[PDB]
Design a protein around this ligand. Structure first.
Ligand SMILES: COCCOc1ccc(Nc2ncc(Cl)c(NC3CC3)n2)cc1
Length: 250
């Protein structure tokens, strides 16, 4: 079964995004509340992402999980493309991260625990994320996490394998998991530069430092999650189980 724009009431705008926007919405028959993404053809077919759209849509469509934002369906109108998403009633993780300095140890750890379950499961559907970052980590009405998937974007997030030219198997997500578990605890991603240029130089060689206020326990996890050669990085089992993790993961 498919859908149409008239089926929904286009309420208030949630985020003034990239390819268009995302709005609050409700299906009339069902009275079901959700988020709706209006993005134009004339937008994606004008950087080239025309195919790579309908691509990851289905990649997502068959997928279901509690720390993964569901897609409920999709469709197109006169001009544009529409994405019928889960609604995450507590906004972006970013929204929270800015409004606070950083996250307290307990909170960070639970956000990582959840991101494991969701990737550990996601690694068994033969799907990898590249750029999972907190512009798109959302919170459910119970306050817990929900992933919502030379010039490109900031790359504080992509591993050295994604920019040296090397191969990128399924242990990408461990890099990202470290980078984030850092950001959550420190305030900035650990490869912040004001030029793309150092950022590149600083990732390839793994160049970062920890403020005083970081437990040796965190530095321990982060350190062994941020390794140049993907080989030496743990399976996501070792992670969920890691000492510092399960000490304060609510
Ligand atoms: C003081 O600021 C008020 C907070 O405003 C909110 C913004 C966003 C949500 N949740 C939300 N749910 C689902 C999606 Cl798909 C989505 N998309 C995000 C925009 C990319 N955002 C809730 C509240």
């Amino acid at each position: 079964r498919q859908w149409a724009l008239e089926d929904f009431e286009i309420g208030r705008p949630l985020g003034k995004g990239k390819f268009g926007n995302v709005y609050l919405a409700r299906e009339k028959q069902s009275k079901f509340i959700l988020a709706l993404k209006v993005l134009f053809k004339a937008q994606l077919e004008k950087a080239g992402v025309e195919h790579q759209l309908r691509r990851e849509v289905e990649i997502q469509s068959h997928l279901r999980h509690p720390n993964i934002l569901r897609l409920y369906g999709y469709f197109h109108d006169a001009t544009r493309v529409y994405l019928i998403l889960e609604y995450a009633p507590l906004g972006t993780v970013y929204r929270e991260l800015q409004k606070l300095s950083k996250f307290d140890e307990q909170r960070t750890a639970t956000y990582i625990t959840e991101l494991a379950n969701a990737l550990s499961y996601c690694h068994s559907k033969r799907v990898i994320h590249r750029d999972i970052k907190p512009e798109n980590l959302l919170l459910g009405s119970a306050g817990e996490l929900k992933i919502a998937d030379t010039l490109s974007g900031t790359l504080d997030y992509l591993p050295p394998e994604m920019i040296e030219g090397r191969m990128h198997d399924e242990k990408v997500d461990l890099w990202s998991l470290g980078v984030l578990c850092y950001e959550f605890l420190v305030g900035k991603p650990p490869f912040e530069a004001n030029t793309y240029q150092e950022t590149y130089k600083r990732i390839s060689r793994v160049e970062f430092t920890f403020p005083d206020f970081v437990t040796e326990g965190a530095r321990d996890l982060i350190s062994r999650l941020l390794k140049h050669n993907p080989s030496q990085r743990p399976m996501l089992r070792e992670v969920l189980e890691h000492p510092w993790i399960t000490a304060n993961s609510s």
